[PDB]
Curated annotation (Swiss-Prot), chain B:
Protein source organism: Saccharomyces cerevisiae (strain ATCC 204508 / S288c) (Baker's yeast)
Leftover remarks: Present with 5300 molecules/cell in log phase SD medium.
Protein task: DNA-dependent RNA polymerases catalyze the transcription of DNA into RNA using the four ribonucleoside triphosphates as substrates. Common component of RNA polymerases I, II and III which synthesize ribosomal RNA precursors, mRNA precursors and many functional non-coding RNAs, and a small RNAs, such as 5S rRNA and tRNAs, respectively. Pol II is the central component of the basal RNA polymerase II transcription machinery. Pols are composed of mobile elements that move relative to each other. In Pol II, RBP10 is part of the core element with the central large cleft.
Location of the protein in the cell: Nucleus, Nucleolus
An example Gene Ontology CC term for this record: nucleoplasm
Lineage of the species this protein comes from: Eukaryota, Fungi, Dikarya, Ascomycota, Saccharomycotina
Gene Ontology terms, MF aspect: DNA binding; DNA-directed RNA polymerase activity; zinc ion binding
Residue location of crosslink Glycyl lysine isopeptide (Lys-Gly) (interchain with G-Cter in ubiquitin): K59
Protein name stated in the entry: DNA-directed RNA polymerases I, II, and III subunit RPABC5
Keywords assigned: DNA-directed RNA polymerase, Isopeptide bond, Metal-binding, Nucleus, Ribosome biogenesis, Transcription, Ubl conjugation, Zinc
Curated annotation (Swiss-Prot), chain C:
Subcellular location: Nucleus
Oligomeric form and interacting partners: Component of the RNA polymerase II (Pol II) complex consisting of 12 subunits.
Family membership noted in the UniProt record: Belongs to the RNA polymerase beta chain family.
Other noteworthy facts: The binding of ribonucleoside triphosphate to the RNA polymerase II transcribing complex probably involves a two-step mechanism. The initial binding seems to occur at the entry (E) site and involves a magnesium ion coordinated by three conserved aspartate residues of the two largest RNA Pol II subunits. Present with 18700 molecules/cell in log phase SD medium.
Tree of life domain: Eukaryota
Protein name, UniProt field: DNA-directed RNA polymerase II subunit RPB2
Protein role: DNA-dependent RNA polymerase catalyzes the transcription of DNA into RNA using the four ribonucleoside triphosphates as substrates. Second largest component of RNA polymerases II which synthesizes mRNA precursors and many functional non-coding RNAs. Proposed to contribute to the polymerase catalytic activity and forms the polymerase active center together with the largest subunit. Pol II is the central component of the basal RNA polymerase II transcription machinery.
Native source species: Saccharomyces cerevisiae (strain ATCC 204508 / S288c)
Length: 30, 65, 38
């Protein structure tokens, strides 16, 4: 079932990854 | 930073209860609400003291001098 | 037309945490020794 649709709580797992990588000032550094 | 001695609202000593609370969580796996209550922290004024504490001192200690 | 090195030009301020900054490849414990806040 690894191809099951995503829930609403799962969007936070993506947001976690966005910030784990980019941080809060990616614009300034990049 | 560093556990408040005495709850602001009623002044029940809360200074002793810190390590004991942190222990009832790691060692006893217990949920926050039971640990607080175990420690006799019944009034929410007292509960908020421990439950919402941020022991910044521990980061502060990480610097050498 | 017949034919008959590396020079310093200036000091450029670095933005902290950038590639050129020391703190970029810095671990948590590293920053603390450097008296910086992680
Ligand atoms: Zn109280």
């Amino acid at each position: 079932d690894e191809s099951a649709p995503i829930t609403a709580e799962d969007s936070w797992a993506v947001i976690s990854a966005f910030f784990r990588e980019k941080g809060l000032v990616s614009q300034q550094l990049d | 930073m560093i556990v408040p001695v005495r709850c602001f609202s009623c002044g029940k000593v809360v200074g002793d209860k810190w390590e004991s609370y942190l222990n009832l969580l790691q060692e006893d796996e217990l949920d926050e609400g039971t640990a607080l209550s175990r420690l006799g922290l019944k009034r929410y004024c007292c509960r908020r003291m421990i439950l919402t504490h941020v022991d910044l001192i521990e980061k502060f200690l990480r610097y050498n001098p | 037309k017949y034919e008959l090195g590396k020079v310093f030009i200036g000091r450029l301020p670095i933005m902290l945490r950038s590639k050129n900054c020391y703190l970029s490849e810095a671990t948590e414990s590293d920053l603390y020794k450097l008296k910086e806040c992680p």
